[PDB]
């Protein structure tokens, strides 16, 4: 839920 | 005896006269010397340290208990002297009157119920917001609404008090007095009557249902906004209590229509002020997640406070991990928003996407598959991220990535700008050490 990658 | 006590202004002698209560009681109410004594008790009312004393609360409560007829002159005195004292002094006076209600019993208490509190709230309904005393009145009334949960039976006496005066206050055509009525109403919910049966329980809750339905169907925007914040507090507090059909109907009403109210932007910002404190609802997370992609266009508003609060819920959602924000909102629309954003909004977006942009635990390979990305696919958002990253984090984190990169090529202007932003980063991190 934090980093798109 | 009391005269030298007030001349010396000493609480010890007043506590002594508190201990001899019957000796104070023996003085007749008809005495003019008792009237001078009462004026000196008003001088005790002036004293702030007596208000701080809990024994102060004790003897003031029994002064209310002593003479029923003196209470109206007390009401006039506190009408005369609301303007002088401060907010903490107002909530102190509210504590005094709460304990004054609690100690009182009998026909004196019934006269107090028919005398003091209803006149104060009637004034607070009808006082203009221009008056600073109006702020004091509804803040002490909000203290009373907070204290009604502490003691049982308070809800019933405020129900029997508010049976005349809440109902026509609901349909008050004037927007300000109805706004104050809504302000007291949204904390007033739920209202209970102990003797009534289950039919009357369901009838009164359905009455409150249609009342909040009409109050959220108000034509004025600020009355709508107060109703929004109130039903947000209701759905936060007691969502387990309402039937699910009513809950689904109200959430569909406040989501399908209310998000697109083009008349006013700050009412949508009031919806935004509501949205973090409903997100504590654990069971309704798929139900709210159904309506989470309905708000993708709200990034493109022209109101500053709307977008500031909007990114505040984006940060709140990424804190609580309720839903995948990249599924909620497109990244490129966010990026052109950054290209059109302002300074504190871009600060909040840097804090929002810092997990996506710069990893601290991941190695140099992840650092460079995000570095090549943030260099190439957009450029101005990268320079704003450079500007806000050393503000947000330590400069060692800047220097480690600088040394990673030191250990787009088609343009000479691109490498010149990269040298310039490296010099800018060096100037930013030199001041730290």
């Amino acid at each position: 839920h934090d980093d798109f990658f | 005896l009391l005269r030298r006590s007030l001349e010396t202004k000493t609480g010890a002698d007043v506590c002594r006269l508190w201990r001899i209560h019957q000796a104070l009681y023996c003085f007749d109410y008809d005495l003019e010397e008792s009237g001078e004594i009462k004026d000196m008790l008003l001088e005790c009312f002036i004293n702030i340290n007596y208000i701080k004393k809990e024994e102060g609360r004790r003897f003031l409560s029994c002064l209310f208990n002593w003479n029923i007829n003196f209470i109206k002159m007390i009401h006039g005195t506190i009408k005369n002297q609301l303007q002088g004292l401060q907010k903490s002094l107002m909530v102190y006076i509210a504590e005094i009157y709460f304990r004054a209600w609690k100690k009182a019993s009998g026909k004196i208490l019934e006269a107090i119920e028919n005398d003091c509190i209803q006149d104060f709230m009637f004034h607070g309904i009808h006082l203009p917001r221009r008056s600073p005393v109006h702020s004091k009145v509804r803040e002490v009334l909000s203290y009373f609404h907070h204290q009604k949960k502490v003691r049982q039976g308070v809800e019933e006496m405020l129900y029997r008090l508010y049976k005349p005066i809440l109902w026509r206050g609901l349909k008050a055509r004037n927007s300000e007095v109805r706004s104050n009525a809504a302000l007291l109403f949204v904390e007033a919910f739920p209202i209970r009557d102990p003797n009534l049966h289950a039919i009357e329980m369901d009838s009164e809750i359905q009455k409150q249902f249609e009342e909040l339905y009409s109050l959220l169907e108000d034509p004025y925007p600020m009355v709508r906004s107060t109703g929004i914040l109130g039903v947000c507090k209701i759905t936060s507090k007691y969502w387990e209590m309402m039937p699910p059909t009513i809950l689904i109907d109200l959430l569909k009403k406040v989501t399908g229509e209310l998000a697109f109210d083009t008349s006013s932007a700050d009412v949508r910002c009031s919806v935004f002020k509501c949205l973090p404190m409903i997100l504590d609802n654990k069971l309704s997370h798929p139900l709210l997640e159904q309506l989470l992609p309905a708000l993708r266009y709200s990034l493109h508003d022209n109101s500053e406070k709307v977008r500031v609060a909007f990114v505040d819920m984006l940060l709140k959602i990424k804190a609580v991990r309720a839903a995948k924000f990249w599924k909620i909102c497109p990244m490129e629309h966010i990026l052109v928003r950054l290209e059109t954003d302002s300074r504190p909004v871009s600060r909040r977006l840097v804090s929002l996407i810092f997990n996506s942009f710069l990893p601290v635990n991941q190695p140099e390979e992840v650092w460079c598959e995000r570095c090549v990305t943030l260099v190439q696919m957009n450029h101005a958002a990268a320079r704003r991220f450079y500007q806000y990253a050393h503000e947000h984090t330590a400069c060692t984190n800047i220097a480690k990535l600088i040394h990673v990169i030191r250990h787009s090529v088609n343009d000479v202007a691109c490498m010149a700008g990269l040298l310039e932003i490296i010099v800018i980063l060096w100037k930013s991190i030199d001041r730290s050490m």
Binding site: - | A172, T262, Y297, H300
Partner: protein, 33 residues
Amino acid sequence: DPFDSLESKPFKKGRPYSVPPCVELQDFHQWYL
């Protein structure tokens, strides 16, 4: 004085929002000052 009708701006529905897909262009000196 109670019961004074004022201007009640009614609920109106529409888009305050615009989504331009410009693709599928930056300057340094403006940010430098």
